[PDB]
Subunit: 320 residues, 3 copies
């Protein structure tokens, strides 16, 4: 059938052969049937969603099979054939809950290469497939092996720098999409979608399955599942809630340290320091005369609203 | 006597023989007198709190003295004999105000290894014993020597990366305790206690002599001296105060960008955005009828409190 | 005329001979005419603001022209002579709008080396001259080139770590000024001015053309153009933002506070309080009410204590 996705990866395994991570240089969404037919017999792929380990020899074969069909992939395979690290072919017949770590990594790659957008893909059950890993300067290292490797580096006057201990590596160690700035890359997870024209500044954060249409200036905290529309600036220290699908529309503005726990419609402005939850009582104002006191949940998705705290009596107000 | 602690360390010295840092693989709290009597004569240890430099030969001899008593410490010492860097034995009669950099480093390891909790160890005067150092990809570097190594690195088209300039290195460059996640390890200082079941997210920060019993979700800032009880979740960019001892009890919830300048008893909730210091006048409420106006200090360490801001008139309230 | 600046730089080029960055070890402000008199003709400098690429040969001649004149610079050039990277001599006649990346970098170094203070130097138009680059453990890398090198590292079980993708690099990969602590150096841009006695903690941030007089404790966000006077502490996650927003001497800014007006000396601001020009504040005296003004009219005033009333949510200023 028409496969959902396929990618040839080079990854890391621990001493018991558990996959810790996979690097895919050139993942493909909706690969052509020609590529799939050319590669399936060599890998032993028949059907379904499979993570298939392949040898250096198979890499040479696959590189030949795709000379004539896809040069970019062929060229990748020739490099992969000389790898000092294990290779895996991830062929997905369908977009379903991931069943292996390799697949988990592939889907996070589809997001960060921008080939798919937040919510587009099934990520259910991803957490148990992504091992807790020490991310270090020499690569992913198993937690049960790390202590020894740390000591060993010290004996040489070197340092094994461990810059993250988590289930998700930082995005930019796998892919840097075009038209993007990320001041401090520890704050953008693999699986984040950083739209063309987005600057993530140092206080900005973007989790997996979340991000920006682009352009925009992101200095706040975009949580898992939160998408942000084009031309929307997030002030330093602000937050989106990590239930209805939270999002930020196009043209929006979000002051520093502000917190939004409901969807914001296009062209919304939010005041610095202000917090809005679903049950936040707001005074709805007009052209600014009072109308009525409603909960923020009932303004969810509305365009051109301006959320500000009244500095004199502390009342939260929405000027239409 | 019953030593308070001992540890065999490999460290780094500058050109004038001042210690910059020490790495202890296997620090011991209350070592057995068997180990001490096996080690003391070979080092020249009589009494007191001493940081004794030892030679490669002594390392062999110490391993040889501890084969049969403690095989882990023995295995460690034989690795240290093959070191390219200077060794130090730190034997402490008593938990006292630190007198050497080696001793300052050891006490920080006792915390981060979870062998003692915050407040259990004496850290008075630690700041002048911890040199201000440049932490780089090649290790710790004396600030006076740094410019030369920076320039020289550039001449080869390489980079000497300088990721911190401080008295406290990051905990994970020394130890990753079991059952822990720390998304950005630059925000956890050596000397932090990160309990089993803790997830420090990217905005989470944990200073020395501070941290979590575990489990927990730390997306806020745990200041020095601040301990956080089990099952207590700190929101995005919230703060504790770094006087009475500021702590957070068990099963607490602290909302994003809230501040707590008073100790919180068990099962306390604090609303996101609310800032409560000792002299914060709170409208104590009941099963939500009013009662009186008290200062937050008087409600310190009380169980099952709910601190919030009135979104209609700005008043700070506590709901029992 | 008298040169405003000169520095001998080592840099990184991509394949279309574009300059990604330059590392100046010993930048000189107002270099003696002696030093200049020796170096200009060997390089072919006539006048104006010039970034003259120069060779390994010239480095030997320029070390020789400065033997007996400036020992630090002579030693610098003998090392540059052995460089495996393209070298640039950056001679500036005046402090004018930057025109090249070499010059842009240099102007950031003058700030970070503390040789000039924020606002004292012309950076108009610097943004386009600072190419967007992946900052990696191996050095600055062209974005167009990065994917190949990322792959190649992985084939050897290595990692090409990309720790920043920005037009500015982190200050500390170029210079660490004396008497300074910076917990997380990803949060201080080349171009920042971190004055003696400053500790920037982990939640602290300083942009370029901004910083601290020193001494100070900066746990908050210091935006471009913002300068913080001596003895002023900034709390965790606090923010500074047209009038040039400054913080005076001996100020205290609470956690997550926001100052959108210039703060006079010895001002205290409560944690979580967000004050902008339009913020309406209950002005209190010696604490009886006096009137309600906008914060803009309290801008620059010394000895003010800003706090939010916990009983009615009013912003209050106690004089």
């Amino acid at each position: 059938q028409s496969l959902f996705s396929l990618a040839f990866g080079v990854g890391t395994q621990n001493r018991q052969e558990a996959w810790l991570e996979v690097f895919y240089a050139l993942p493909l969404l909706k690969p052509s049937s020609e590529i799939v037919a050319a590669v399936a017999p060599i890998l032993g792929y028949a059907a379904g969603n499979q993570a298939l380990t392949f040898t250096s020899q198979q890499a040479y074969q696959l590189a030949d099979a795709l000379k004539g069909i896809d040069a970019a992939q062929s060229a990748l395979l020739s490099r992969l054939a000389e790898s000092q690290k294990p290779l895996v072919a991830t062929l997905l017949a369908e977009d379903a809950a991931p069943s292996s770590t390799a697949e988990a990594y592939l889907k996070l790659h589809l997001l960060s290469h921008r080939l798919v957008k937040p919510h587009a893909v099934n990520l259910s059950g991803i957490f148990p497939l992504l091992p807790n890993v020490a991310w270090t300067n020499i690569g992913a290292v198993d937690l049960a092996e790390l202590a020894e490797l740390q000591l060993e580096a010290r004996l040489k006057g070197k340092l094994l720098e461990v810059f993250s201990v988590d289930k998700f590596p930082k995005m930019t160690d796998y892919v840097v999409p075009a038209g993007v700035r990320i001041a401090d890359t520890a704050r953008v997870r693999l699986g984040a979608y950083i739209g063309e024209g987005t600057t993530v500044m140092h206080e900005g954060f973007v989790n997996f399955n979340a991000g920006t249409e682009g352009p925009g200036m992101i200095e706040g905290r975009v949580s898992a599942g939160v998408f942000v529309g084009k031309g929307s600036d997030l002030g330093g220290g602000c937050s989106t809630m990590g239930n209805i699908v939270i999002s930020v529309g196009e043209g929006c503005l979000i002051g520093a340290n502000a917190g939004i726990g409901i969807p914001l419609g296009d062209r919304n402005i939010v005041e610095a320091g202000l917090y809005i939850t679903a049950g936040t009582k707001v005074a709805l104002l007009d052209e600014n005369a009072l109308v009525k006191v409603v909960k923020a949940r009932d303004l969810a998705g509305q365009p051109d609203l301006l959320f500000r705290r009244n500095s004199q009596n502390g009342a939260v107000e929405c000027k239409t």
